[PDB]
Design a protein around this ligand. Structure first.
Ligand SMILES: [Ca+2]
Length: 228
């Protein structure tokens, strides 16, 4: 997270993280008790979701390390075409139900699509600098603004679909490598999932690109609304 700051600890109780061992893979969002939403390009055969975390190295005390027993990418997501990022979404089913409270808790899915100029929040453990990477130990937060789609399209010509949403900052706040799969929160709801962006991060002319969650409501709800 460029141009941001260290989040107040556990102020994003929905924040998740994908670990393989001690190696941090991606961010994630807790949208249900046993359900974690992330980016499809983070798919791995085996990994563990960590919740209630702030410092990667240090014990904060909320941490819950829960393995995932099912990975469900979006059926129209394509790993073949690189740079076709459309439908970058995956739901991870947790073996165990998460223990919930002020420190850990699912976030409501946004039932509205957003509007340009909407101020939002991104969080993650991804690099705080770019191009020279610095991966912080503590979760970082930044405020961003929803870009109009046609500015988004012109920023990445031909690469933007209606399942994507652009969010950027004049002062350089942007998601970066290691934040993928993490939350985009607008008005206390989950508006998006960190998908991809430009090189370097935090370019005034290039906003971050997030999977537009208002478009996927019926697919997420169906899977997480099942008997699983
Ligand atoms: Ca910790």
């Amino acid at each position: 997270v460029l141009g941001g700051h260290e989040c107040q600890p556990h102020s994003q109780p929905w924040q998740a993280a994908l670990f393989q061992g001690q190696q941090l893979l991606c961010g994630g969002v807790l949208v249900g008790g046993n359900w974690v939403l992330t980016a499809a390009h983070c798919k791995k055969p085996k990994y563990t979701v960590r919740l209630g975390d702030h410092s990667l190295q240090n014990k904060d005390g909320p941490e819950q390390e829960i393995p995932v027993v099912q990975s469900i990418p979006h059926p129209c997501y394509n790993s073949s075409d690189v740079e076709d990022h459309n439908h970058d979404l995956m739901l991870l089913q947790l073996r165990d139900q998460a223990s919930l409270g002020s420190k850990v808790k699912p976030i409501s899915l946004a039932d509205h699509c957003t509007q340009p100029g909407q101020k939002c929040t991104v969080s993650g453990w991804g690099t705080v600098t770019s191009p020279r990477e610095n991966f912080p130990d503590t979760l970082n937060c930044a405020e961003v603004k929803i870009f109009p789609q046609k500015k988004c399209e012109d920023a990445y010509p031909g690469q933007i679909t209606d399942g994507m949403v652009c969010a950027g900052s004049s002062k350089g706040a942007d998601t970066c490598q290691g934040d993928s799969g993490g939350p985009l929160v607008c008005d206390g709801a989950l508006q998006g999932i960190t998908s991809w962006g430009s090189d370097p991060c935090g370019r005034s002319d290039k906003p971050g690109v997030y999977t537009n969650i208002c478009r996927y409501l019926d697919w997420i709800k169906k899977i997480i609304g099942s008997k699983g």
